[PDB]
Symmetry: D2
Subunit: 267 residues, 4 copies
């Protein structure tokens, strides 16, 4: 239990990676406040964890919902140690040529309001509390914040924008708050596309050096690491690629050592 007594606020924690994070942080001894728009999924979370979790129904695009989540977390758990802005929506890799002219403006706002402005509002709302606890922020980025072909122009630009948030907020909030970003890979979640615009495992296993798409729980360890003051004190402004090795894949094969057992005579 590395995070006993710590309080953590997670946006988009009712499903997918966010939900795995709530489960992992509770197992590490933390209390977790979650801001999510789905009342039903938040109810499930409260059923499973009881008073180890606090559900706040609200939209990340709303600074007022964000401030309500922060004040309720402070009221219930006394502080906010770690903030994990994670809620997001994908653009279903719609290429530029396939983005319809009539909804490009609306899709731009949907994607950027959720994925980028929602991240800024979480930090703005929790700032006073994070400074008081000398806490930290861990942004969920994705391989889309580093390499192409993880989404179309909208999602790729929005996730690259979060790299800029990591660097600029690591500078601005130092020396009180540490700010780091996790470049997580593909997950079998319920990630939705933009309303404005109306397999993963098998496709990707040939391009990932690790040779398999990780389960959603295998992506929680990096967040625990960055949230641990005793292990991550020198980490601020860090960007951890954590997607199975997409950035080091080969030209013609994902992995270059599929034949290592045979080459070294291991059995």
């Amino acid at each position: 239990m590395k995070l006993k007594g710590e309080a953590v606020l997670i946006t988009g924690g009712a499903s997918g990676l966010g939900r795995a994070l709530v489960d992992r942080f509770v197992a590490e001894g933390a209390k977790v406040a979650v801001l999510d728009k789905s009342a039903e999924r938040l109810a499930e979370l409260e059923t499973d964890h009881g008073d180890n979790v606090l559900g706040i129904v609200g939209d990340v695009r709303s600074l007022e919902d964000q401030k309500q989540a922060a004040s309720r977390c402070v009221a219930r758990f006394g502080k906010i140690d770690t903030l994990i802005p994670n809620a997001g929506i994908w653009d279903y890799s719609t290429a530029l040529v396939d983005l319809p002219e009539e909804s490009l403006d609306a899709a731009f706002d949907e994607v950027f309001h959720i994925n980028v402005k929602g991240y800024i509002h979480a930090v703005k709302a929790c700032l006073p509390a994070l400074v008081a606890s000398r806490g930290n922020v861990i942004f969920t980025i994705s391989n889309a914040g580093f390499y192409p072909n993880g989404g179309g122009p909208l999602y790729t630009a929005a996730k690259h924008a979060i790299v800029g948030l990591v660097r600029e907020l690591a500078f601005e909030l130092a020396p009180y708050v540490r700010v780091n970003g996790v470049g997580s890979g593909g997950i079998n979640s319920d990630l939705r596309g933009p309303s404005s615009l109306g397999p993963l495992a098998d496709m990707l296993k040939s391009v990932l050096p690790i040779g398999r798409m990780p389960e959603v729980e295998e992506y929680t360890g990096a967040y625990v690491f960055f949230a641990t003051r005793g292990d991550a004190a020198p980490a601020t402004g860090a960007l951890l690629n954590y997607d199975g090795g997409l950035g080091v894949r080969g030209f013609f094969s994902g992995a270059g050592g599929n034949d290592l057992l045979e080459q070294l005579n291991i059995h």
Copy 2:
């Protein structure tokens, strides 16, 4: 005259770096179409260059103004070889803690609609023409797309977003259109801040390795290079840091060799 007969479309070309680019590209033999919201400054440009330039008054946030600029450029000059999305607004380095809650939503849209959506709309509007000419796109980024302290969270995230546009559009438009980004530094322009939120040379000379802030005309050579098919054919998805060396400055001094003349006995 490296670009004789080439046609170039520049957004935000009526002032500052954009205007220097128009002057340089005309001097290289190109015809230049400019999309800018300032009627008055566009008039000045037309006075100076005559029919080597074409002024289109319009907003980069409007896909219809962008499409009007592209069709007028094609009508007048027959094609579009190079597109340079460059219009932008700064956030006056307003830190997160100083961004007022009541105008954060509006400032987010002003900054992102101009600096990011305006860049996407320029490419969307000029796509058919760029594919026909096997042309290229050169985005104006800034040191703010790479390092902190070049603006607050809004401008730093928006310029980092353009790095994502470079990578994703270089992939998507290959092999027909090359897409590259220029990380230009500080200029003595008329760069304005957000309406929503209501020296440079002397401050920065101690932190720049080159020891002086470059004149606006010294930043035009990199664009000419990327627009030259005979010199930049292997360049796609490239990001050129071009800001005086901010990224390689030292810990305690901008430059590490201020004493080299004395150390080597040069006079």
Copy 3:
């Protein structure tokens, strides 16, 4: 005890960061084999940890000493799960202009043989064992592998070379062995300079965003993370900057939020 029953081989583990790593990994339940040239310091380590550690006196530049360390680790502890090539020497930030012509060749070999070839030999020697255990390699890099002014040309080029080892070996050894690199910062160790060429805390606290130079034990958490199969399975080819935020420091100040308590009225 996150690494109970794991076996770890550390080069240069008798002093400084290496020694802190041995202490931390033993505390996490691992058995640790150490390859170091100092017989005396290895004796101290064996005194402190008894049969939780194994000392092998040898030079990292010698492939035969490296192979002896690997076979002794396998003989004693049955396997090798994690390999941490860490031994190194600094160049005392001797700039290019100050490197004497008469010893430049010798200094080049001393620095590169230890810091780079020593890392390749450790992986070559432990390869068969790492493939059998599906283990991982964690290279100690430094801020010198990312930014200037952490050493002169020799040390900066040698540490940047290790970034190339991370990427190329992450590709080549996948999908069996994960390869990651830690960009650790300044430590109060006994790091020596090159024989060929014959404060830290107080100097650096004004340039580090965290505002203090971390103790040597605060740099061990990132290695434990990467060595934990249950937390770092998606991490291969990763480079973690872990130096107090040097890469996100400001232009005129290390940290941009020294006044946050006063600005937010915290007491």
Copy 4:
């Protein structure tokens, strides 16, 4: 003729990319001194260019040969404006598992002495002249200095080491000398492998976004750009990826827009 009256020194200029560079720089009006070990190829160069070129037979691993090249260039052409360290040898992508134990030490020195130490010696020898002319250094790197699978561990680590030279020497030689690096791609040259260890176009066209391997002359434009004081004054410490887009290639296809003509109805 962008470089009339400029003097340029190129190492490894008698063949492949180096030779194309000599041809291009002479065509731009420069005088070029070349340091190469091949007497025969240097003779050919002198036959083709006459007294626009100066051939110095010598080894880049020898600081004395390097100093002889620099003093002869200064004697003949009066100065040294641009220095282009370019000589190199490949490792034939020999993976770590295939590197023989008995020649690993010798191969390490052959590769690093030529590719890395040869680059340091060129700058050391030409330093006084570069400071006097406020000149610049352009290192030939390669895609191997950025991504895996461009060579084995030795060549990939050596080319990544040159990125460290770019950053550290850009800092140390500022504000007098600009230092930049070109990440050139695959060429149909006579690049040899290590003596110690005893198609390209067709293989790579499916992974390059541009869809073809560039001719050797198409890689010379970036060097001319960086050597032009009037166009590259703000460029120092820059790293230009220039390899056909390897870094932005897709997961399943090199280019993502092979069908753009059909999708946009162009003919």
